[PDB]
Each structure stands twice: as C-alpha cells, then as structure tokens.
C-alpha cells in the first residue's frame, strides 16, 4: 500500500501490490 | 531567469500538478522494495516521478522543455504499464495527464 | 518606468450578450472572489512603478486583474463565459510566472484559484 497524509490531516491509501 | 519555457514548466505546469489533490502517489519515486513490488523494475526500465522532475527543474538540469515534457510522459506511461486500467492510481494519472496537456498547450514561445 | 494603460474593458461595436453563465460569473464567481480575504493584491492592475518592478510589463505580456474582469462583465466585452474564465486563468498564471514559487502572493493566488475552480465546477449549463 502507498499511503499519505495530506494537508488537513486527510488520509489516502492505494493498493499498488 | 530561466528560459521562458523552462520557467513556465516549473512555475505553472509542475506547480499546478504538484499541488493537485491527486499528486501524492507521484511526488516521489516508487519504492518497489517497501511496496513489495518484486517485478516493478523488470517491467519499468526507466522510472520517473514528479519529485525528480521538480529537482531537475529547480537545479536547472534540463537543457530544454522537451527533456522535461518527456519525463512527465514517462511518469504517466509507467503508471499505465504497471497498473490495471480501472485502478484508482490510473484514473489519478489520467486526470493529471489531462491537466498537464492543457497547460502544455499554452507553453510560451521562446 | 511608467505603467501601461489598463486593459480594454469595452468593445466599440458588439452586442452585449446576457446569459445564465455570464450573470453567474459576475453575481456569484466574481463577487465571491472579490470579498475573499486574499483578493486585495488582485483587485487592481499591478502598479509596477510604485512596487519597483521594472521588468513586470516586459515579462507579463497580457496583464489582467479582477477590477478589469469586473468592468468587462459589466460592459459589452465578453462573447461568452469561457472568455471570462480565460481572463481569470491569465490573472492567476501571470502571478505564478512573475513571482517565485512559495512566495506569499503566489500562495494567495493559489487559494483564490482553488475557490474559482470550485465555483466554475458549478457553472450553470
Ligand atoms: N500486490
């Protein structure tokens, strides 16, 4: 999983594997 | 200042894509070890990402706008090669590419 | 070292249009941006003389500001809403081209442009 915290404490993930 | 086109690529094109809501999977190289992608470098022979493009522009490493445009296109193409076409990351790349081509259509003349 | 005359805001022989999208750009989009806390650097043409920017009008070939856009909307200037949308985009792009990335004025334009694109996303059909 690619994961990130975006501004505003928005969380996003992507299942690349 | 930089040439009109390279300055435009950094201050308009890269900035617009960098601050887009879909930018984050493309802001750094794909870490195939951490992501457990044992085949990534077999399939993707020339990795590219916006973090690398940003550093090349900021350090004046590009000789012309074509080299920079090719790097953006390589980044998108890599995403399309590796991932399934319906996947979220491909939809994200397609939206960034659409925006990229809109800004590239207005590249200033030298 | 002298400011150019501001952009034209009227057309010497054109019918004024009046449409759902044009009234929306003036009544909703321009009004919302005009009152924004970051609007004030963009409400009038760049005063390159007072701000000591001797290169501004050499670098920025099509200057644009929200005061000009407002007058164009009020007059007969635009054929359609998309011509007005281009002026907003030119205003934002000018700021990004002239100023260094990350500068305060650039961050302000980015916040205005984000709000603008949100309002354009709701442009009536
Ligand atoms: N995976």
Residue numbers in the entry:
A (entry chain C): 1 to 17
B (entry chain B): 58 to 167
C (entry chain A): 42 to 166
Excerpt from the paper describing this PDB structure:
Within this class of proteins, the bromodomain and extraterminal domain (BET) family contains four members that are transcriptional coregulators and that recognize acetyllysines (AcKs) using a tandem pair of highly homologous bromodomains (BDs). Despite heavy academic and industry investment in this area, the generation of paralog-selective inhibitors has proved elusive because of the extremely high sequence similarity between the bromodomains of family members (90 to 95% within the acetyllysine-binding pocket residues). Using the highly conserved BET BDs as a model system, we conducted three mRNA display-based RaPID (random nonstandard peptides integrated discovery) screens using a single library (which contains >1012 unique members). Crystal structures of 13 distinct peptide–bromodomain complexes revealed highly diverse structures and binding modes among the cyclic peptide ligands.
Interestingly, the most abundant peptide (3.2A, making up 3% of all sequence reads) was related to only one other peptide in the top 500 and not to any peptides from the BRD3-BD1 selection. In characterizing the BD-binding properties of the three peptides selected from the BRD3-BD2 selection, peptide 3.2A proved to be problematic in SPR assays. Surprisingly, strong binding was not observed to BRD3-BD2, against which the peptide was selected in the SPR assay, although the peptide did reproducibly show an interaction with BRD4-BD1. Like 3.1B, both peptides bind two copies of the BD. In contrast to 3.1B, however, almost no direct contacts were observed between the two BDs, suggesting that in these cases crystallization might have promoted the bivalent interaction. In the 3.2A structure, AcK9 forms a direct hydrogen bond with Asn140 in BRD4-BD1-A, whereas the AcK2–Asn140 interaction (with BRD4-BD1-B) is water-mediated. A prominent feature of 3.2A is the high degree of internal backbone hydrogen bonding observed in the structure —nine backbone amide hydrogen bonds form an extremely regular antiparallel β-sheet connected by two turns. The 1D 1H NMR spectra of 3.2A and 3.1C also display well-dispersed amide resonances, consistent with the formation of well-defined and stable structures.
